[PDB]
Amino acid sequence: DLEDNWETLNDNLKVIEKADNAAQVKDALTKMRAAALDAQKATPPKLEDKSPDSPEMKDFRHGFDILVGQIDDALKLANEGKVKEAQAAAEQLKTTRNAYLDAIPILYYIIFVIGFLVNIVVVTLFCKVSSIYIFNLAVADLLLLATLPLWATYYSYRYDWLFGPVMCKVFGSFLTLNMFASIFFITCMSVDRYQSVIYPFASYIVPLVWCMACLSSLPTFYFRDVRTIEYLGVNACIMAFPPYAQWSAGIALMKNILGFIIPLIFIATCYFGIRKHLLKTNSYGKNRITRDQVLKMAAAVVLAFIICWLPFHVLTFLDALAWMGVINSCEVIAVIDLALPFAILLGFTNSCVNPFLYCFVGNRFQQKLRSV
Amino acid sequence: ADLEDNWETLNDNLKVIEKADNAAQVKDALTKMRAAALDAQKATPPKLEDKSPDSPEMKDFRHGFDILVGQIDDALKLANEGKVKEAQAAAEQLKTTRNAYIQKYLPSDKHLDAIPILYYIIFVIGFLVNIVVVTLFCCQKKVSSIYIFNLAVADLLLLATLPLWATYYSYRYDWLFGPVMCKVFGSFLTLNMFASIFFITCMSVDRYQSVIYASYIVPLVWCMACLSSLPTFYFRDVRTIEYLGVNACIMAFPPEKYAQWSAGIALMKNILGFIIPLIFIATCYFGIRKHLLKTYGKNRITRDQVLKMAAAVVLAFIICWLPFHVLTFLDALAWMGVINSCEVIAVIDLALPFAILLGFTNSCVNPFLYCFVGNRFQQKLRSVF
Ligand SMILES: CCCc1nc2ccc(N(Cc3ccco3)C(=O)c3ccccc3)cc2c(=O)n1Cc1ccc(-c2ccccc2-c2nn[nH]n2)cc1
Numbered sequence: 152d153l154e155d156n157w158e159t160l161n162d163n164l165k166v167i168e169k170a171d172n173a174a175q176v177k178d179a180l181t182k183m184r185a186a187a188l189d190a191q192k193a194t195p196p197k198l199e200d201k202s203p204d205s206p207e208m209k210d211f212r213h214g215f216d217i218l219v220g221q222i223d224d225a226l227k228l229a230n231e232g233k234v235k236e237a238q239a240a241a242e243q244l245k246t247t248r249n250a251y252l253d254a255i256p257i258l259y260y261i262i263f264v265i266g267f268l269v270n271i272v273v274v275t276l277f278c279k280v281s282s283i284y285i286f287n288l289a290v291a292d293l294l295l296l297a298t299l300p301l302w303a304t305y306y307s308y309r310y311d312w313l314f315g316p317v318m319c320k321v322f323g324s325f326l327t328l329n330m331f332a333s334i335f336f337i338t339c340m341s342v343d344r345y346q347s348v349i350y351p352f353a354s355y356i357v358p359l360v361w362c363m364a365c366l367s368s369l370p371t372f373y374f375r376d377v378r379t380i381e382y383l384g385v386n387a388c389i390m391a392f393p394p395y396a397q398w399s400a401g402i403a404l405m406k407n408i409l410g411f412i413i414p415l416i417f418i419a420t421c422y423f424g425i426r427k428h429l430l431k432t433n434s435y436g437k438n439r440i441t442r443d444q445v446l447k448m449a450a451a452v453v454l455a456f457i458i459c460w461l462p463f464h465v466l467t468f469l470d471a472l473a474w475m476g477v478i479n480s481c482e483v484i485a486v487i488d489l490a491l492p493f494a495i496l497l498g499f500t501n502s503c504v505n506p507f508l509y510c511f512v513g514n515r516f517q518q519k520l521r522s523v
Numbered sequence: 524a525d526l527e528d529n530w531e532t533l534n535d536n537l538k539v540i541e542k543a544d545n546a547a548q549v550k551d552a553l554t555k556m557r558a559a560a561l562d563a564q565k566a567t568p569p570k571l572e573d574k575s576p577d578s579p580e581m582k583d584f585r586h587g588f589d590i591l592v593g594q595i596d597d598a599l600k601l602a603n604e605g606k607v608k609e610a611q612a613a614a615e616q617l618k619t620t621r622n623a624y625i626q627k628y629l630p631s632d633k634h635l636d637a638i639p640i641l642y643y644i645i646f647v648i649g650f651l652v653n654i655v656v657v658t659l660f661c662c663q664k665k666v667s668s669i670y671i672f673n674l675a676v677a678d679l680l681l682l683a684t685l686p687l688w689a690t691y692y693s694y695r696y697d698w699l700f701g702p703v704m705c706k707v708f709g710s711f712l713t714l715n716m717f718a719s720i721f722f723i724t725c726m727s728v729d730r731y732q733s734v735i736y737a738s739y740i741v742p743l744v745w746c747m748a749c750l751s752s753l754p755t756f757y758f759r760d761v762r763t764i765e766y767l768g769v770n771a772c773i774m775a776f777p778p779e780k781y782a783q784w785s786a787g788i789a790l791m792k793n794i795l796g797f798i799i800p801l802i803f804i805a806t807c808y809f810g811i812r813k814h815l816l817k818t819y820g821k822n823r824i825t826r827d828q829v830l831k832m833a834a835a836v837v838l839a840f841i842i843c844w845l846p847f848h849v850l851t852f853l854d855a856l857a858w859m860g861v862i863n864s865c866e867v868i869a870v871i872d873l874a875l876p877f878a879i880l881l882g883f884t885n886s887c888v889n890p891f892l893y894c895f896v897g898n899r900f901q902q903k904l905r906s907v908f
């Protein structure tokens with residue numbers, strides 16, 4: 152009965168988008184208004200045991216009054232003969248449809264000190280072109296790990312910003328600038344290792360990698376601000392999008408493409424580009440033992456990237472579909488929310504892995520390649 | 524027996540030798556080649572028509588075929604002995620001879636110091652002007668404003684490649700960055716050049732849509748730019764030019780039909796990069812012009828100003844991109860065999876880096892056309908309506 156009224160509201164929503172005349176739009180909105188009023192009186196199979204006078208059955212009923220109110224606004228535009236305006240008011244209904252632990256701080260700090268220690272070891276031992284990318288990656292990793300105490304304290308006050316709205320934009324962007332600079336230098340490292348594997352034959356690339364990181368962190372500086380979430384009654388540092396569902400889905404999609412898809416394309420093309428070349432050699436003696444060892448070092452950098460960043464990017468794509476209206480079951484939406492800070496920690500863990508993948512096995516890679 | 528038709532025969536049978544399983548199949552293709560090579564030695568190149576037959580240019584041409592016939596006879600000696608794998612290996616050596624021909628019959632000392640300086644003086648300016656846009660959006664905090672950001676980002680990435688080309692041109696076209704960078708930076712250049720053009724189009728459609736009166740368009744514009752830069756990614760590679768002793772980053776088309784590919788790709792550059800975009804820019808301008816001329820004394824001053832802003836974006840596009848696209852169409856006809864005057868061909872080559880620079884200059888103009896007159900367009904449009 153509840154799935155039968157929401158199917159009607161979601162069916163006609165698609166109709167409004169594919170409609171060309173205002174008579175088509177008014178017809179779908181009339182079928183919606185009736186279904187919204189008919190759904191307002193029904194009890195869902197999740198709250199079928201619940202009482203009608205409960206505070207849960209005070210706000211969820213109020214939610215429909217908002218939905219009917221938004222349908223009437225769209226109806227007023229359609230009756231005036233305003234297709235583009237009534238179709239725009241229908242996009243606001245999508246946003247209404249979507250609206251319908253001590254271990255975490257300890258874990259943020261334990262990986263902070265470790266990551267700072269292993270990366271301060273890289274900067275000091277370094278103190279070649281490949282070695283110039285190691286320094287920059289170690290610097291970008293060090294600055295990213297340095298922001299961990301801030302997010303640990305932010306979570307200790309259960310999502311509360313007490314540092315200022317300027318710090319929300321400044322430290323918010325600084326986080327994104329170094330996260331991308333770390334990802335984009337991992338890519339440089341994979342392209343260089345591939346270039347050396349094929350042919351044994353950098354003051355422009357390093358400033359470009361920082362410029363691309365500055366550009367990719369501009370929506371972070373444009374949207375991040377201290378806001379009051381009326382739902383929880385708290386002051387949080389969030390992406391203050393204009394009146395919102397479209398922007399959250401669009402930005403979630405940009406996080407995956409620039410931060411995982413495009414980088415992983417490169418990491419994977421370089422690994423299989425190194426695997427194909429070293430397989431065409433056909434080694435038999437101790438060279439078969441040597442080629443396998445080189446291949447293991449090539450396999451490690453691509454496998455460590457997907458172990459550290461795939462859990463978070465999977466959660467981000469699932470969240471994007473929620474704002475689109477694909478996934479609507481609140482039970483599944485709650486799981487994404489709970490798992491999110493553990494997925495965010497794996498991203499920071501990649502900075503602890505990096506010294507072992509490139510610097511600590513740097514000399515070994517070149518010596519075993521010049522051998523085969 | 525027209526040299527080009529003789530090369531088609533030599534290249535056709537080369538493919539036959541590779542797909543052949545018996546020595547009788549190989550000897551048959553080599554016999555057809557030997558005849559075609561002898562028949563091409565008596566022919567005059569479709570550009571050396573003016574030059575005498577005893578000239579040193581005509582001497583190396585007839586000599587290049589004596590090498591080619593000599594290599595065919597070596598392969599024939601193997602095929603007659605019943606040596607398929609050996610005759611097929613000798614056929615791979617003909618490929619090296621055919622490539623030494625196409626480099627010559629299809630200089631770097633045309634160098635000017637002015638070109639690298641001009642590439643840098645517009646790089647810093649463009650970068651500065653585009654950063655100003657990015658920073659002013661930051662200071663400020665619309666759908667149109669979301670296309671300004673993307674266009675500025677595309678422009679910034681395109682300008683960032685100018686030091687690579689001002690350096691490549693300075694080493695008389697000797698690529699010292701690596702063959703991987705030739706594919707990577709070659710495609711990156713094309714990806715952002717199209718993304719800049721395709722977002723100019725979005726901006727003109729939006730300004731027209733508002734004059735009469737999105738989270739899907741921006742990713743599609745980048746996807747269309749990715750697709751349009753696939754022939755650059757597939758063909759850009761470092762190739763050795765033995766004549767100059769210089770490794771150059773060039774479009775490595777199959778030498779089997781190299782002239783056909785250069786003409787076909789030159790035409791794709793004009794349709795996707797100028798014709799289709801210009802159709803939209805021009806339809807939107809005259810679409811806006813038709814709306815303001817319909818629907819005064821005091822109210823004519825304001826409408827004229829709005830039309831001047833509409834006229835600027837279409838006129839700046841043809842000033843920046845028409846010189847290069849004209850040169851590209853003239854070059855396509857050279858590959859076809861239409862224009863054969865080396866005097867006229869030399870002019871295209873000399874003018875081309877300057878017509879290339881105008882394309883990059885469009886990125887310096889863009890901040891003045893959309894961001895710096897952004898507020899003015901909306902305030903004067905909400906006035907007339
Ligand atoms: C190495 C992990 C990096 C990382 N560290 C984080 C640390 C803390 C927070 N959280 C949640 C949290 C958990 C514990 C305490 O708080 C925050 O409250 C928060 C506050 C201010 C700024 C930023 C985040 C999330 C992340 C988080 O998602 N990430 C990943 C990440 C980052 C930015 C972008 C990004 C990229 C392009 C365009 C826009 C954006 C963006 N996303 N949010 N704003 N801007 C994409 C992925």
Ligand SMILES: CCCc1nc2ccc(N(Cc3ccco3)C(=O)c3ccccc3)cc2c(=O)n1Cc1ccc(-c2ccccc2-c2nn[nH]n2)cc1
Nearest residue numbers: 688689691692709713716751754755772792876879882883
């Ligand atoms: C904003 C101007 C953009 C621009 N910058 C360029 C910068 C440098 C070079 N030149 C010549 C030069 C001059 C000075 C120093 O070197 C190069 O040597 C060169 C080297 C590697 C990659 C590319 C170009 C040319 C151009 C150049 O023609 N263009 C215009 C352009 C670009 C690509 C395409 C294009 C579109 C669809 C399919 C295929 C292609 C294509 N063309 N060449 N490869 N791929 C069409 C027009």
